[PDB]
Design a protein around this ligand. Structure first.
Ligand code: AKG
Ligand code: NI
Length: 279
């Protein structure tokens, strides 16, 4: 057998219209588990946005950089508050999201715009309208956050469907289909080595995972019972995958060129007639 642990497609962004039910196929039919979509953004756009962040002409994006220094020396830094990290009132989250959307729009200079381009892809892959959710008092969710992984840094193993048990999700649970959520991200800059997305074929099992202080130890126990795939998309490629269902991590960055990625999550509306995307 030459079957890998998970089934991913690999397409060029110019071809997304040939896959008008891909989102349905991942979430509903489970006929594959993810896709790499090459060239969603030009490499030149990725270099210019990265230079904005490096040099600080970033539209204010540096004002919402969370260095996560309290959480130790292995953790990612993040521009914007991700919703998984938040209290159920979401006040600070919605304020960061406003800053993020304006800064992001300024850095991409419409060439192409980040939100327009990502929405184009998700529309093509579903046939559905695509929206960033609105909060209950008219706030904006953020479409994305930017993760910054320096040398030696990683994103520890986690699984997206845990969000459905967090109080921060209360308002989104009034809008979303409560089946799997997908993850999407696009690298802005890639490291010399390491910084791979590792997706396990182990599926969401919150009762069992909860017995471990470290979720990595759970993965290591199941490995004792061909159990994962690793991906390193290049700049401007989108990785879209069933992060809700499958445990996943990002491996440690090797070398002094940081890994910078912009992305978030997506899911159907309750009636599966719209796609919502956020971080
Ligand atoms: O590497 C990133 O930016 C995010 C990886 C991840 O955990 C996800 O896409 O759900
Ligand atoms: Ni994730």
């Amino acid at each position: 057998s030459t079957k890998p642990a998970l089934h991913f497609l690999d397409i060029n962004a110019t071809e997304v219209k040939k896959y008008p039910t891909a989102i349905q196929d991942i979430i509903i039919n489970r006929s594959f588990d993810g896709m790499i979509i090459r060239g969603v953004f030009p490499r030149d756009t990725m270099e210019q946005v990265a230079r904005c962040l490096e040099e600080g002409n970033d539209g204010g994006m540096k004002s919402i950089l969370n260095k996560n220094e309290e959480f130790g020396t292995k953790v990612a830094q993040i521009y914007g508050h991700a919703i998984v990290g938040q209290s159920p009132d979401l006040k600070d989250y919605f304020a960061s999201s406003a800053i993020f959307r304006q800064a992001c729009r300024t850095m991409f200079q419409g060439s192409p715009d980040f939100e327009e381009q990502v929405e184009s892809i998700f529309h093509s892959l579903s046939g559905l309208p695509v929206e960033i959710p609105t909060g209950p008092e008219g706030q904006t969710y953020t479409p994305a956050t930017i993760r910054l992984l320096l040398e030696g840094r990683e994103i520890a193993v986690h699984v997206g469907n845990d969000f459905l048990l967090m109080p921060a999700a209360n308002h989104l649970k009034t809008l979303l289909d409560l089946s799997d959520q997908l993850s999407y991200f696009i690298p802005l800059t890639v490291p010399e080595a390491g910084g791979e997305l590792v997706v396990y074929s182990l599926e969401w099992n919150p009762q069992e995972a909860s017995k471990y202080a470290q979720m990595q130890e759970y993965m290591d126990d199941v490995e004792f019972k061909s159990q994962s795939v690793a991906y390193a998309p290049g700049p401007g490629d989108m990785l879209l995958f069933n992060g809700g269902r499958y445990y996943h991590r990002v491996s440690e960055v090797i070398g002094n060129s940081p890994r910078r990625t912009i992305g978030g999550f997506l899911a159907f509306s309750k009636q599966r007639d719209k796609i919502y995307y956020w971080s």
